[PDB]
Enzyme design. Structure first.
Site, PDB file in Angstrom:
ATOM      1  N   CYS A  73       0.848  -1.227   0.000  1.00 30.55           N
ATOM      2  CA  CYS A  73       0.000   0.000   0.000  1.00 30.55           C
ATOM      3  C   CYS A  73       0.882   1.275   0.000  1.00 30.55           C
ATOM      4  O   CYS A  73       1.509   1.536  -1.034  1.00 30.55           O
ATOM      5  CB  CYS A  73      -1.004  -0.140   1.165  1.00 30.55           C
ATOM      6  SG  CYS A  73      -2.372   1.073   1.255  1.00 30.55           S
ATOM      7  N   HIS A  74       0.923   2.042   1.101  1.00 30.53           N
ATOM      8  CA  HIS A  74       1.824   3.209   1.185  1.00 30.53           C
ATOM      9  C   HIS A  74       3.225   2.829   1.685  1.00 30.53           C
ATOM     10  O   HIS A  74       4.170   3.620   1.564  1.00 30.53           O
ATOM     11  CB  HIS A  74       1.240   4.326   2.061  1.00 30.53           C
ATOM     12  CG  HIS A  74       0.060   5.029   1.461  1.00 30.53           C
ATOM     13  ND1 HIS A  74      -1.224   4.550   1.571  1.00 30.53           N
ATOM     14  CD2 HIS A  74      -0.036   6.196   0.777  1.00 30.53           C
ATOM     15  CE1 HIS A  74      -2.061   5.383   0.982  1.00 30.53           C
ATOM     16  NE2 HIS A  74      -1.367   6.390   0.489  1.00 30.53           N
TER      17      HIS A  74
END
Ligand SMILES: [Mg+2]
Lengths: 185, 185
Positions: free
Chosen positions: B110-111
């Site tokens: 994800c991030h």
């Protein structure tokens, strides 16, 4: 003096509260009005220090419901999550780019500048931001500096909440001077 | 297939909850163990959808106190605020860089891949991430693609919570193999 001037504040959920409220208060104090523009109708969750939910703020329009000609300037507040959500939405990024290409003054603080990178605005631009954006902004072709307030081509940037006193003064100067088309050719 | 394997999880405040707890449970189900590594002692704040504060999780070790040879692999969970906080700390970025340079398997979701950009690991890497990281990862020299789970040079990347089942399956087989310093030469 911002009498008769209306500023667009573009922000999603996750906006740093003080970076929305404090510049908005400067704009109104200078005689202008602001409107909160966002992705979805209703309200937006503000934060403190990125992760502590604070107040909720009512959205005046969705991004697709407004045009560039209704505004005399643009404010891009930070808070990590907000610009990270904005940069994924085509209408949001189109509005930022259109604002720029129409010559309208633009202010971004802290994480706010991420939208200037996504739209290509950062390229060849002298600017600052929160320290974590340095990499992307330098890679994106920015002339990145660590300074409390930077103005280039009618684009005002600052790094953090403590830059607000200097940012608020500069944004008012730039919103008052108006169309910067000739400085962006 | 992970009995006797210890995986370091590097996360700060702002960590997406499921991206910490789900991969940790898959590692533990495989017979492995994990330790939460962070910037400050005590606990970190997990979030749901980046902005709703969920549970706090206890930190095991500060980053400037632990050794690479202590671990068989590295998990980098997402949530927007967490890797944005992580990437400004030299201690934390040196630790993710040493883990890579010693050949240990790395997983980022994800991030989470933000730390792979800051640290130079993203250059020449085939990888994915949450969509908002596409621009930076591209400018950093990554081969960015929009896929459920990508493995290259023993670095496993995924985009979002939906990808958890596949991410979890891949990380257990990658943490099982180990030593990719031959593939990263
Ligand atoms: Mg000017």
């Amino acid at each position: 003096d911002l009498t008769g001037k209306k500023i667009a504040i573009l922000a999603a959920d996750g906006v740093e509260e003080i970076e929305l409220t404090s510049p908005r208060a400067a704009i109104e104090a200078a005689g202008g009005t602001t409107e909160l523009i966002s992705l979805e109708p209703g309200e937006i969750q503000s934060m403190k220090g990125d992760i502590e939910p604070q107040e909720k703020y009512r959205v005046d329009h969705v991004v697709s419901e407004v045009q560039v000609s209704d505004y005399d300037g643009l404010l891009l507040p930070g808070g990590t999550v907000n610009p990270d959500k904005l940069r994924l939405e085509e209408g949001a990024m189109k509005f930022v780019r259109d604002m720029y290409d129409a010559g309208k003054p633009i202010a971004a603080i802290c994480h706010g500048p991420w939208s200037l990178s996504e739209t290509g605005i950062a390229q060849g631009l002298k600017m600052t931001s929160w320290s974590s954006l340095k990499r992307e902004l330098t890679l994106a072709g920015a002339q990145w500096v660590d300074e409390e307030c930077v103005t280039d081509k009618g684009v005002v940037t600052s790094r953090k909440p403590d830059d607000l006193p200097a940012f608020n003064k500069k944004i008012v100067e730039e919103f008052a001077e108006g169309d910067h088309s000739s400085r962006r050719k």
